Each structure stands twice: as C-alpha cells, then as structure tokens.
C-alpha cells in the first residue's frame, strides 16, 4: 500500500514539526555544500505574504538554529523563483529524535489504521463552501510583482474540481490580481524577466468529513491548523499557469 | 473509495433492452458524482444535452464529469466499474472513429456523421442513453483548435462571410471519415478561453527572443523550399551579426516563452484518458491503459 | 381493516391453521408500543395459541425443456409438462398453478397470539426482536408530514360585527386591540408563540416581491381575452398631449358630444367588499399584484398590456382595502402618535 | 473607465492611417431608457463632413447620388448599396454600468484625478460609456463637421442622433524603470465636462476631456467658416426631409388619381353598403380625415415602414426569383409527371402596414400592421389583425384608412371600402437619401449567439445591475 | 398595519408508529442460496454475500393496507420562524447600492452571493448555504412561507381545510387526462372555484402570473436565480406541471401517491433541506394527494388564547369570533395528543 | 405486448376471483397494466403463426 | 506483463557478460508484443545521418518504456513497469542522482562501454537525467540552433562555445552541436522555424484580436495588452482582409504550435528515493 523513504535533517527544523502529519519539502540550495535541505511547510510562511503578522512573529521566534536561519536566507536571497528550487515529497509519519534526526515520508500513502495532514489557517483556503463528498488538495505558489521584494503567496487549498483546466479557469478569477501586476511589471521593467505567476501541484484525495481544525504546541507557542483526518497522498508535478 | 458502482432503473426492463445492456459491456459511460449508488436518470449525457447551449458548454461539463466502464449488467442492476490509473482495461468504442495501435484517446461530446441517423438507442420513454465519443488525440485536438479558431475569427464579421467560413471550417475529415461540429456558439466559456489565448499570444510577442523574430527572414535569405515558400507566403501579407548576444538572456527568454506556449497549448490539448495497445481487426474494441 | 383486504389468488389448504379448528386469514405487524396498546385495550378478544407453519422453504426447480426454452427464447413457462399434457389431452383446466405446488406437507408448530375479528382470525406481530441493538431503522417507524396554513392581520368587517364570547373575555378599547396585527400559536410544546409582520419583514423586503416583470411577461403572453364581456373592459385609449395649449383648449374636448370609455381601475372600484371576489367581477383577471396594477390598452391601434406601480396604499381597490379599514388604520396611527383623543 | 483609456490607445495606434481623433462620451437616462441600456448590443458612429458627404463614399460624388426609379428588381441599388452603407458605419467600444452613480464621485473613487473648476455633482441612474472618432483629412479639423450616433439592440432596432463639431468643440480648441501610460493617464486625470445636444435638441450627452489624450500634442488646427456652416445647415435640411417629401408625393398622387377617375371611387375592400345612407357626410369626413393625415404623418408612417424592408439585400434576389416565377408559361406535362414538385406560388395571405385616421376625435395610428387576404366569393380585400381577428374599422363611419402593399402599391379607403389606388413614386429622391436615412441593421457576430445563421436566439445577454455582477 | 394581510403556510413532520395488515399468502417470496464474492488483499480478506429476493404479488386488488395509529414526536419545532427569502434568491440586489445595504441592515440578512457554475453543482449536489444554528432545543425549524392576501379575505376559508392559494386544485375531481379542463379548473377566473363557489378568495395567489405563483412555482423560480436545495411548503400547491401530471385515473393516482409523490427532507440539519440519495426515508404526505392545507390553532389576542387553554379537553377545536379579533380551531386534535403520548 | 392469444389458448386454472372494486371499474381505471378487453367473440386467437 | 526478446545474431561468453552487466536498465521497445526481435530493442532502429536529435525525443514520447532484468538462454526477459509500483533502476547518464528528484528520458548525447554490438547493430540506450537537466539540455540545444544560421561572427562563436559546456552537480557535460558541416538538420530547422513563425505571427495577429475582444467586456488586461502592442510596434518600426486568408494565418499559427509540443512538455518517467555510493543503481517509483 504505502511507500516510504527515510530522510535526515538538522534538529532546528524538527523543533516545530514534531507531530507526524506535516508536509516535507526539499529545497535546492544555490550553494553546493548544503545542496539540498528538507524544509517543512511551516517554514514557507515566514516568507509568505498571505500569513498574518502574529503568526509570522511566532514563526520568527520559533526558529533559532544557524541551519534554519540559513534556510531562510536562501529562501529570500534567490532570484524570487521559489518553485524552481523546491520539490515536495508527500507526508511524514515517524518520530526519531536526535542531533541529526531521521523522519520518514510517504511518497504514496493510504494508511490502513490516525494519519492526517497538517495545514495552518493562514495558508488554507477553499473556493467553494459546498463541501463535495471527495476533495482533492493542491499547493499553489503565488508570485506578485508589485515591488522589488517580489512578495510571494503560499496557499494550500481543497477543491472538488477534478479537471486541471477548469481549475485554472476558476483560479484565474481571484488570481487575476496576479496577472495585472505581472503585466505591469513586464511593461515597467524592461530588464528583469519573469517566468510565470502561479504554479499548481496536486497531492491527495480525501473526504470532506476529514477536514477538521486542530491546535499544535511546541515551544509552547500555540498554532491553529487545519487537519485532514484521513488524507491520502498522490504527488503531482509543479504545473505553471498565467 | 468505491471500486464498484451500482446503477438501478426505475422502469421495468424488456429482454431486448437487457440484451442491449449485456452487449454494451466494456463501453465507457460518464457519471456526475463518482458515488456508490445512482439512479438511471443521472447516467449518460441526455441529462445535460440542451442543443441550444452549444458544444462548448457540453464539452466543459463533460471534461469535469468522471468516467466508468460497464460490467456485470443484469436485470435492473448495471454495476459500473470506475477504472484506476495504470491498469490494463478492455474498452469498446462506440463512435465511427477508427482506432489504430499506439494512439492516445480523449473524451468529447459526439459529433455528426454521414448516415444522419443518430440512432435514438435505449429510449426509456423520455430518457435516452446518449454516450460520448472516445477520440484519438489528433482529431480531438483538431475539434478544439477549430472551435478556438472559429471563436477568434467569427467576432465582428457578417453572417454571409461567416457562412462560407463555417461551411469550410465545421467539416473535418480524419482517416477518410466525414464529421462536422454540431453547435458552434460563442459562450462566455469560449470567450474566456479566447481571453487566455489573446493574453498568451501577446506575451509570446512581447518577451520572445529578438532573433527569433528574424530567424525566418535570415533562413529565407538562406534557403528556398516549398515549406519555406509557404512560411514566407504567410508572413508576406505584412512585408549579419546581432550587435549583442548573451546566452543567459536567451535562456531566460526562451524559458518564459515556453511557459507562455504551454499556457496557450493546453487550450487545445485534452487530458488523455486511454492509451491503446490492441485492436480487433473489426475496429469494434481495443485494450487500453487508463490515465488519470 | 381486516375486511378491507381481498383474498389471495392461491390457497395452501393446510398452512397456518390453529388447533381446535381455526384458519388464519391475516397477520398484523406494528411497532411494539402500538402492539402493547392493542394487547391491553382489546384483552378479551385476543388469544395465545399454537399454529402450524411450514418448516422449510418450498423448492421450485426447472425442467430440461424449460432450460432449452430459456436458452432459445429467454423465457420460462413453469410446469411445462403439465401444459403439454393438457394440450394433448384437450383439457383447458389445470389442477393447480405452478406456485401453489411447492411448500406443503412439511408443517411444524409455533406459538403466536391471535385475535378474532368477526368471522376472521388474525395474527399479531411486534418485530422489536429483529431491530433491537441493531443500527438499522425499523420500517414501521415512518415519518409523515402535514401542512398548516393560518392568516395574520385579517380584518373582519365592522358593519357585520358580532361576538359569541362576551361572558368569557373583555378587552380595553385601545385600537391595537380592535385592529389585529399579530397572531399567536402553540409551540411543539403547549406554550404560546407570537408571529408578527416584523418577523415576516425578512421575506417582505426581498426584491422578488417588488419585481412585476415575470407577472407582466405572463400577462402579455396570454393576450387580451376574447369573451364579449371583456371587450368593453379592454377599450381604453391613453394619449399624451403637449401642454402648450391645454389652458385654453378645454372647451374643444367637451365640444364634441361623444362618450368617454371607462377604465379597468375605475370599474374595479365600484364593487362591494364581498361581491368583489365573486365570478360576476370581470376585472379580476387584471388583479395580479397588490403593489402593481395591470390593464389592457390600445396602442398604435393594437391591444397592448400595461403595468404601473401603486405608489401609495390608497390605490388599493375598495374590495381589497375598504374605507373603514383605512379609517381604523388611521386610528391605529393616532394611537401610536398618542393622538386618539386629538385636539 | 477602461473603455475611454483603451479607445485613446487604439485611436493613437491608428491615427497614422485613419486620422481620427477620439471623443469620449458618457450617456444617461436622457438619451435611452434603463431597458435600452440594459439590453444594448452595439454602438456606432458615422462622420459627415460640411459638404454632406459620408466618410466612406467617394469624394467626387458617387452613383448613389443618382435617383432610384421605383422598380423592385434593382431595389434602391441592390446589395452593393447595402455594402457601401455597411462600410461607412464604424463600431466603437462601449461599457454599461447599471447601478445609480454620479460621475464625479465615481471617478474620484477610481484612480482618476478629476480637476473640474467647480465640484458640482452630476447624478445619473445608469451610465453607458463610449468613445467615438471624428476624422480630419489633414492636420486641420473643421467646425462644420457633424457626427452621428447610433445605439443598436438585439432586436435589430436602432435610434439615430447627430450633432455637429462646433457644439462638441465649442471651447476645447480655444484652451490651447519605465512609466506606463495607464499610470500617467490616471495621475493626469480630467478637467472639463460639457453637455452636448443633438441638432434637433432632443438628446443630452456628456463629453469628458482627459488631459493626457494623445490628440492634444498634434498641434492640430481648427476653424469654422460661415459659408461652410451654411452648407452644413442646408445639407442637414436635405437629409431630414426624406419622409416628408415621400408623404407629400403620396398626397399628390392621391389627389391626381382622385382627379383622373372623375371622383368615382370603386370598391376594393369587401363591406356591405346601403343605398339610403347619406354619402355626402362620408365625403366631407373623407376630406377632413385626409387633411388630418396630411398634418399628423410622421417618420413612422406606413409608407416609410414598407420602404424599409425593400432596401435590405434580400429584396433584390427575392424580386428576381418572384418575377422569374411569375414569368412562366403553362407547365409542360413532362415536368408535371416527372421530377421535382412544382414551385410554391405566392401565398393567399399578405402582410401590410396601414395608417388609420379618426375624425370623431383627433387621433391617428401610424405603425399599424395588418394582414391582407382576398375574399374568394367576391375577389375583394379583407383586412385581418396580426392574431387573425377581423378589422372592424372598415365599418366605422368616422374612419379612413390608408394601406400600403409590400410592392409599394397604396390604397386609400373611406367608409364602405370604396378605395383610391395608386403607386408610390420614390422617383423624387436620390438613392443616397433613401439608403442613408432608413436601412435595417444587419447583425455582426458577438458573444452569446450561434455562429450558424438562422438558429434560435439564445437568452438575451442583458448585462444588468439588479443581479450580483457576473464573472 | 400595512395595507395587506399575510397568510402563512408551513410543513411539520412527525415520527410515527404504523400498523399494517396483510392476508395469508399475499406475496410469494422467491429466494436462492446466496452468491459470495471476494476481495483479496495482503492485509485482510473480505467476503461479500448476496441473497437475491424476488416478490410476486398474488392479490388481485389490494391485499395489504396501513394505518398510522400512533405518534410520539414532532421532528420540527412547529414554530413561526419565517422563511428567509434572501437565502433562496441570493442573486438579487436592489439597483441602488445604499438602499440595498440599508435593507440588508433592516432584515437579518447578509451580502448577496453568486449561485455556483453548473460544474460545481454537478460535482456537489447542492449549496447548503444556511449554516446550522448555535443550538437547537426545539428541533428542525418550521419555515413559514407567506402568501400575500387582501385584508378583506373571508375568514371562514381558514376555519376548514382548504387550498392556501385561494382556488381548489384537487385533480381527483377532474376527469383524467383532460388537460384543458384541468387548467381551466386550476387557473381560469371566469368560472367558480370548485370548492367554494366564489371565483377566488385570493386574487393575488390563485391565478397565473401572481406574486405567489412566481415566488413558489418552480417553473418561474428556475427563471430567477434561486437555490434548489431549500424546501418550499408552497411548492406542492403551486407546481402546475406536477399537479397536471397527477391528473390520472383513480388507481394510477393512488399508486403515484403512495409510491412516487412522497417527499423527502433531511433529518441531520436543523433547516428543512430536500434529500437526494435516499439515505433519508421518503416521507408520506396526504396533503399532496388532497391538495389542501390544514388549519392550526391561531389567535389574534392572548385573551382568547387564555380562555381556550384554560377550558376543558376539546375546547381547542372550537372557533370563536369577536368584534374583529378571531381564533381558528385545529381540525385535528393534535395539540392534546402530543401531550397525551408524553 | 403480452401475448393474449397464448393466454386465451393455453389451459388456465380456476380460482374464486375477488376484486375489491367492480371488475369493469378496475379495468377502466386500469388498476392493472396491459389489459386486453373485447366484447363478443373476437376471433384473433385462432390465427396461430 | 513480460516480453521476451531473441537475438538473430550469435552470442558469446564476454558478449553475454556485457549484455547482463546492465542488470536493471530501461530499454524502449516500439510496441509491446509478447515476443520481439533484437532489432526493435533500442534506439538503433530510428537513427540516420539526416534526421537530428529532435525526432528521437518525439519518437521516445510515443515509444513504450520497459525495464529489463534477466538474461535467459537465447532470449532476454523484459518487464513493463506499472503505475504506482516501485522498481530498481540503473543510473546510465552522465549525472549523479539524489533522493526525491524526478527523472526524464532523453536520447544519448555522449558516450563505449555500453556498446553491445552484433553485426553493426548497437544497443544504444537512452539517457536518464533529472528534469532540470533535461530542460537545460533541450533549451541549450534549441538556442544553439538559432546561433547556427549566423555562426560566422566572432561573438556568435564565443556564445556557441559557452552553450556547449553545461555544469551540473559534481559534473560537466560537453554537449555537441546540433549542426554538422554548417548545415542544420531537418527537424531542428523545422522546429526552429515553427517557433520563430509562431512568435512572428502572434506579433501580427495580437492587435486585431485585442481590438475584436475589446468590443466585448473591456478590462484592464486588454488595455495593458494594447499598450504593450504599441510599445512593441514602436520598437520594431524603427529598424478588411479576406476571411480565408485570416483563417489560414490562424490555422497555421495553431498547427505550428502543435509541432513544437514535443519538446516543451518534458514528461517525467521516474522518481528516485535511495542514496548510494552504490550510485550505479537506485530504486524508483514509476510514473506515466
């Protein structure tokens, strides 16, 4: 059924994520020494423009280690292209603490007896309130071009729309603000060049009754998250749209 | 969740209809919900087919609809089976389109054809099991391309010019068959598709490598061939070193151009559902691998 | 209830009979509480007895000729050899049908409670044992719904005033008591609940009520009626005129001695309150909306429909809102303004 | 908002060829009803210079200036005149805003910095945005030029408005990383807002002058010569009179045939009569009714309404087919026994338009449609209503009715059905006037309609403000 | 008091105990030995067993019958919480923005919402826009539909079971398949109402094109932007197509009634939503067959309510009238039986 | 569609029939589906093919 | 789902050792019959001196992919990987892998030890490389196609020299030119001219179709499109049509888009999860 692999990370990254059901994302460092570093979804928020100031402050206070600070420095310092430096690996289910910790991720999983996915409130959205019987979930990276800092958006959403093209048809409505700013940057700055606005990655299928809200506590700094109580994973590719 | 779907009929069934059902085994039928148990009214495309709302609307509804294969049908129990990704299945084609080995299959609303019958099969008084067409990639993307070209051209034109334009455009021949688009209508769906196409074409005009605009003309100065004669003939209706060259700029510009092209491309491409590797010598059925 | 049911087609002559000579004609099934009520209430007429029931299911099996007919024609004729033999012999009457020839000669005794209804004997059953501790619903615990309708803010005519209760209740002469604007009902419990126009406000304010467009569409689609009585109601012509000479051209209008036709609203006014709703009122077909009036008119020598809004409540016809009702409503307004004893 | 900016960009792009500068217009409940704004399909404009020549017709004079001679075969020039008039009409970009608003507050709420001299708020229940162009053949613009405006609805109906340059430009010509043009457009804003009226003083519409409009910088020249405006006035007089001279031609024909027949009028519509009715009163009522029709005839009289479909491109081919079908000898037996079934002859029923006048009270009706059929037992005409009901106004003694046939034959009728018959003489006017003043709109494809011609009309688009805005 | 009176109409559902009678050997039940199918996996093996039951009816006419002898509960609150017309038509807005906002303030409603695209409605069989209440001691809400009536409407119409639209439309009276006669009976105002021989007791509801017709006839509601998930008590009295379809011969009408005309309302959510998948039982509804609504204890003043509650058993059925204050009595002695089971 | 001539020809069994309403009333109201009804001797059952 | 393949040629001990040393490599076969001949095994059946690299990519897209792990007697055992299962795969390209990456299949651009030659037929396997490397290689080859048409001026040769060498993690690859004897092979020329004509035709058509769309619901996107189009026209310029002609241009643009679809959409074939000094081999989940 499920397929797993064993991964190694520094202790600083594990401090916030210890509960199993977190996503595992592998970032591509520009430097060749820490060429690949495994960051969790929570680490994306502190550089995400859709999070709240309170949660951003909490995440800033959580991470202290030089590895985590260097991960943030790499995430900010690159040429604004995030998804070109990221590959996702699914969901995690193991606890193995240590100075160099081991965590196991399910690249393809449907666990037979609780396995869940953890998404924070700031990162979570849904197009339709009409909860369909079966819901797919997606990861969207949003690229605004209003300023030189190139503020990115990092979203995880659940939707009953099965066909990707209709999903883009509906996504281009709200993210039309991306398209306008993209064209504005294309005219205003002749020199720097963009690739796209948004990227869609599909991983999962779960029922609407599995969508619960839950709290998380490590370092005592409380976080509110959405919990997909029986989520199964199926990794897709990073697929670009404008 | 469900590997089995049970459909049941409210009507009493005749043995002729039971024979037709047991003949239609291994065919493809669409389902709106992907659910355990459905009534027979919400099976097929007769539910959605209002010809006033043209082909684009029905295509948009059908591409969101889920698909299933037919199975152990008996007296008032259909038992449809939803195929999962990657397994090898036997599927029976129902349209007149010829299937040949190695082609990828796509789902589209049925088109018109020569024998003019349309065969009002399985009429349960009013309900009538209209079944979609499963089409290989070239013809299906031809339908999509011709519809998009139809919408792009037809705007701001009189019906007289459009008459000849649609009389040439609506008719498609593929492997010496003769099909025609049932209902070309300019809905908001096609209008948004054209909005995307226009934005994509503008972007590819903007960010494209400066030399790729003039590569055709440099080659025309270099060469003279039937392909290039036609290429020049297209551009003719509006008719040395580069002072700088930097590989990084070209790499970034072509990456952006590929992003824009892939944005424009899938306005025509249909997500393949089946890939064939078998054919009955009577073209009546094929063995396929499912794509999701 | 027992007499209402007709007798079945077949009879298994020995099945379900009771010792001391009784034949069962029916069986009743109901929830355990209903059955208990029946047991207690009808004590004398019930009896607990032992009855004979078949021990095993009756087996029906196919003949090879039936199998071949099923293969060739997708059909089965049970007891096929009986039909063949009776056709060859020439007797049009069979001894027994194919169904009743199965399930006999295997009776066994079980004990159940029975009652007598006239000349009939009927079994009583309570299936609590089947569904207890189970998560499935008892089909005898069905749901049935009823529809209730009641008015609020209705007006009894003052000229026909009458009371059947004066020794029971008395009310203060305050106008709010005279003109009702509320209604009082009972909850799911025996407690009083109050409904007002204020609660209705969430429905009254929605635009669909104030949109006469569908009403005008259906009113135009029907067209003017062809009945001869309707022809006099139809003939009204409305024509605009410039105001430049209106101050002095008054005698010219009256100079010609020709009549001026009535209009639908003015004809609607002249009906009594209760006479308004009767079939003798020809103007009812135009009364599709309270807030908007309808009429047929002549335009470009063709008959067309017209819709205008009733700006004020006064435009309501006399049969729908009478003068006394308006005066009592003004009295209610005075009561709100503390003006019932006016200056 | 977006239509004005886009139109500025588009006119800037094409000014090299067309040499039209853009003029931004906003219209309100004074020009069109809320229903007409809610159901508007196309907005069109046409420029007429001071010589009375449309932009799209040959400068030195054209063959359309020649008269037309009443024949249905070459029906007012055929399809080529329709194609020319199609070519002369140009289409603009427009938007509809159905919710009540005031332009000052709406533009301040937008990114545009309005800078009008005084903050007088102008309120309107609904706004339709459009921008029209007016052509200067060279860098010189003339104040005697006139611009036409048309609003087109899905039923094919349209209304015409025309106003001249000197009202549009009464004071405007006397007032004389990388930046995106949208940014400076919004930051420069607008400051002057004026009311313009149609020549007949029937429509009020507002014009907006954005300081960052591209037409500013061309240092174009403007002047209005007096003789030039006199020419514009007399050309406008020539344009406006088409229907009235047609009505006068009908009048003179009626009187001429009434003189020719010695006043003896034979019956043409079937109605019972009496020998002992006083007919002198009927004759005098006919005189009064005729005078009243002469007075109250309008642009929507039956003769113009019947002339209008004759100008459509289908008329010429239909006239050819009908004449060829009439131009037949007796059918040979071979074609009767073998081959296709016979061509269907003209129907036993016809569609007509009529003007009805009343003497008892001052009242006429002009755009009246009536169906005509011949009574078999007497061979006379019977007038039926559009629903099939019989028209009783023939019996009514106070009524005289003028009928016009599709082939431009007209019957004048007094009580009893005794009639005066003659043909319409459209000889009096040039083809240009008939073809310009009246012509049916021909649809061009847009959103929400079938590409296949002749298919059933889908739901009318109906951009509306009573619903939540659709996306 | 505004210049019009209102008539409310609501549906209340009861959970009941049924008593059924069947004769000896009514139906012959045919059975086979079960067929077993298997799903095989490394973790566990699961067996599916299936017995095919077939029933053959051996009764010529009717050999089984039911009676609803006993009840003990009301699933709905039997309240007067008025139905939210803004929720069922979320598309519609007032043309001026500020007046629309002021009306949103005046009512207890929220900003308008767009009804979803067809694909959303096909993947998700409904909107379910009204969220659940904070708490529910009283059960499912009874949403009262209000049909506008003239102030002078004859009160005697409300004292007996009748049709709330103002004209009887019971198809058991008309001859079958005569659609012209049925339409004349239900809509024509040039002939008397079949029940009370007035032309109509509500000209704003009884004829085609009325306000209540467009509000509650699903033919007109589909023209508007409306939500199909919300149940409507008026729909059974206003859907002309269903009423005409129910005009049949006696026994086919009976079959339609007990099998296919029945309602289905969800039992999980506190507002009455229509069901789809049959996980909720079909609900019997005599009011559809009779095409009439019943009267409920209703009073304009608390004086008559006190004097009727204070009296003995059976005083609830009587109807009393004052100089303008009135009370209508319940046709069914239900308000005391519901105490009696308690 | 039911073969009525077969029912007329093939040997039937006798029963004490019991319809709640009148037999002709139930036939006119069509309590049942697919009813053959004729008066007199209709010879259709004789032609067998 | 297994396939057996028989050699018409004569095997030998060291020949069999060379054959088996690719224990779990991937071999593409044209169509999946139960029994096939060795000629179908590999890319050798497609290559010639006139075609060029582009076609092998497009033909690899439609050619069935298959994993090999055995050497029987005179026949070879093949296995078709199925979706959702995990398999053991070999590293055959010049790259080194890392856990979690996605893999793409490419024609081999560099090479001898793989050469199982029998009668001048060679077992030429494709390349397994991660998706970024595949994208980079295809983009650089397509770019170097453009620089071939001039190729004379010194800076163009310097640029071509720079494109030829690509650096990836712990390796550098000497990518060859797509042109030989200063001629550009035919599919390379065809795709290059199709892409260039797509851009050129869009540049012309965008103005007319932005105007035609503007008569519909005018919005900010069309305004910015028009502004960019005027900007493009101003920069380029300083250097009533018949319906059938317009439809010809549109259909030509769309079909020229179709011919380029093969190279833009780089498809994934495997995803890796194993880290090894044993780097020769890795375990992968199958996609397709």
Author numbering:
A (entry chain T): 44 to 156, 162 to 290
B (entry chain U): 4 to 242, 254 to 306
C (entry chain K): 246 to 588
D (entry chain G): 1 to 176, 298 to 592
E (entry chain K): 1029 to 1370
F (entry chain H): 1 to 49
G (entry chain V): 6 to 116, 121 to 248, 258 to 306
Can you quote the paper on this entry?
The remaining portal vertex reconstruction was generated from NIEP 3D classes containing a population of VC2/NC2-like PVATs that, much to our surprise, were inverted 180° vis-à-vis VC2/NC2 PVAT. NC2-inv portal vertices similarly contain CVSCs with a full complement of pUL77 and pUL48 but otherwise exhibit different PVAT head occupancies and configuration. Most apparently, NC2-inv contains a VC2-like pUL48/77 decamer that is flipped 180° relative to pUL48/77 decamer in VC2. Gaussian-filtered NC2-inv maps further reveal (i) very weak densities identifiable as pUL47 bound to pUL48 in the inverted decamer and (ii) the presence of a weak layer of density nested above the inverted decamer identifiable as a pentamer of pUL47/48 dimers. The second copy of pUL77 head domain is invisible in our NC2-inv reconstruction. Intriguingly, the inverted pUL48/77 decamer in NC2-inv is much higher in resolution than in VC2. This enabled characterization of extensive interactions between pUL77 and pUL48-l, facilitated by pUL48-l’s linker and CPD, and confirmed that the polarity of pUL77 pentamer is indeed inverted—namely, pUL77 pentamer’s positively charged DNA-interacting funnel faces away from the portal channel. However, whereas VC2 decamer lacks extensive contact with its underlying capsid (VC2 decamer is spatially localized only by portal cap binding of the genome terminus and flexible linker–CBDs anchored to the capsid), the inverted nature of NC2-inv’s decamer allows each pUL48-l copy to wedge within a valley-like topology between each asymmetric unit’s P hexon tower and adjacent CVSC helix bundle. We speculate that this interlocking of pUL48-l with underlying capsid contributes to NC2-inv decamer stability and thus the improved resolution of features we observe.
Composed of a diverse array of proteins, the tegument is an amorphous aggregate sandwiched between herpesviruses’ icosahedral capsid and outer envelope. While tegument proteins in general are well-differentiated to carry out highly host-specific viral functions, tegument proteins related to the capsid vertex-specific component (CVSC) have in recent years been identified as key players mediating critical functions universal to all herpesviruses. These include in HCMV the CVSC proteins pUL77 [pUL25 in herpes simplex virus 1 (HSV-1)] and pUL48 (HSV-1 pUL36; also called large tegument protein), as well as pUL48’s non–CVSC-binding partner, pUL47 (HSV-1 pUL37; also called inner tegument protein). We resolve atomic structures of portal vertex-associated tegument (PVAT) and identify multiple configurations of PVAT arising from layered reorganization of pUL77, pUL48 (large tegument protein), and pUL47 (inner tegument protein) assemblies. Analyses show that pUL77 seals the last-packaged viral genome end through electrostatic interactions, pUL77 and pUL48 harbor a head–linker–capsid-binding motif conducive to PVAT reconfiguration, and pUL47/48 dimers form 45-nm-long filaments extending from the portal vertex.
